[PDB]
């Protein structure tokens, strides 16, 4: 089971958005809500490292 968080800008100040399922992220991608992508990471483990969601295949984690 995998969970995501994302922010609109790749900065230390941008608001991060609560825990989301992979299916949730996939739905938002396919519905045009991240037209330039968002900076996302898995919530486990804590390390993080943010990636542009445009390069993330959320369907791989379902």
């Amino acid at each position: 089971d995998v969970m995501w968080e994302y922010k609109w800008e790749n900065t230390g100040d941008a608001e991060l958005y609560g825990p989301f399922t992979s299916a949730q992220m996939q739905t938002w991608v396919s519905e045009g809500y991240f037209p330039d992508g968002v900076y996302c990471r898995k919530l486990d483990p804590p390390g993080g490292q943010f990636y542009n969601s445009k390069r993330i295949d959320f369907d791989l984690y379902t």
Binding site: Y51, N52, R55, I56, L60
Partner: protein
Amino acid sequence: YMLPHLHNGWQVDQAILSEEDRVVVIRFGHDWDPTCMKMDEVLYSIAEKVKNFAVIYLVDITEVPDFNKMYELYDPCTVMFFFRNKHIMIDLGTGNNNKINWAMEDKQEMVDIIETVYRGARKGRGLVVSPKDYS
């Protein structure tokens, strides 16, 4: 607690052939090579972390030249990925989807790549995208 090495083509064949549920990660190069030294330190330090879904092997392409023509192993350091006997391609944004041929010393980054390869290939993808664009 060194990384395992394979010493001939036959051993490499058996290793690629032997994992039903783990990515076979192969570093083609030479221990003496500086690029290989930096890549090996990454692989060594993440081997335990990824061990459930990836096994890493080091191959000296002087001792084992069998694949040099096949995979155009002309770079100092080449990391390639295999799942269920199949070469798994990764779009790294570099134009070459066959291999990682530079020492990336970002540990977690390498872990994330291997995990993407594993997850992709398990779902039958022969091509997967790397989370970060490498230009």
